[PDB]
């Protein structure tokens, strides 16, 4: 699994 | 910089199916940590999170909600688009889409679900 | 589900005074080091605005007033002073765990 991403980068 | 924008139906019986299209600019759905997502509100209510798709085809999907969506991506189009199928009318809504890092929000349209 | 509940559901606050808001986790939104919880705000009209992420992290650019706090399951926003223009809805997110959830949103009222 993965992980949405939130925040910058 | 990036930009995010919705295409939708307008008005929907009760008991269709709504389409929404997400045209973008500033990024290819192909480069890797890539993905679009789409967030729904209510007439001020607050945030649902409904679906997700990612730049490798895996998708994601409010399990509540994972019956009646389908998101899809013409990725050499710039276009992540989402089906809701068997629209009732607690489902006018707004519809955003966000892409991956939730910083970058399109301005969002709105669906009514009225006979 | 992870379930965020914030509080207070409404606000009124004067202007440079300090405003606190809360968000709590049905469990921990954490790695065990940096936790997924981040604070939206949103003005009428627009989209939500990301201004805080991981708890703690400021986004580039928004007011230094605006901190975070906590970790696994309590986490709470700060505005300090609060200016005019932050009479918004603020809402908590979580992302450890799909499916990603918002809390029901504080709003910031202006006090008279």
């Known amino acids: 699994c993965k992980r949405i991403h939130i925040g910058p980068g | 910089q990036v930009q995010l924008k919705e295409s939708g139906p307008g008005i929907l019986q009760p008991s269709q199916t709504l389409s929404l299209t997400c045209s973008f600019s500033?990024?290819?759905?192909?480069?890797?940590?890539?993905?679009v997502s789409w967030i729904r509100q209510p007439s001020g209510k607050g945030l649902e999170w409904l679906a997700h798709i990612f730049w490798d085809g895996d998708k994601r999907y409010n399990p509540s909600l994972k019956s009646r969506l389908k998101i899809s991506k013409d990725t050499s189009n710039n276009q992540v688009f989402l089906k809701i199928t068997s629209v009732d009318t607690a489902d006018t809504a707004t519809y955003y889409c966000?892409?991956?890092?939730?910083?970058?929000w399109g301005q969002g349209t709105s669906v009514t679900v009225s006979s | 589900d992870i379930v965020l509940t914030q509080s207070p559901g409404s606000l009124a606050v004067s202007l440079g005074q300090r405003a606190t808001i809360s968000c709590r986790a049905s469990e921990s939104v954490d790695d065990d080091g940096n936790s997924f919880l981040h604070w939206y705000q949103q003005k009428p009209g627009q989209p939500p605005k990301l201004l805080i992420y991981r708890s703690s992290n400021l986004i580039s650019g928004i007011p230094d007033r605006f901190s975070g706090s906590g970790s696994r399951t309590d986490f709470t926003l700060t505005i300090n002073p609060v200016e005019a223009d932050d009479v918004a809805t603020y809402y908590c997110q979580q992302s450890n765990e799909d499916p990603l959830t918002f809390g029901a949103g504080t709003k910031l009222e202006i006090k008279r």
């Open positions: 500033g990024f290819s759905l192909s480069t890797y940590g890539m993905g």
């Open positions: 966000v892409q991956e890092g939730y910083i970058y």
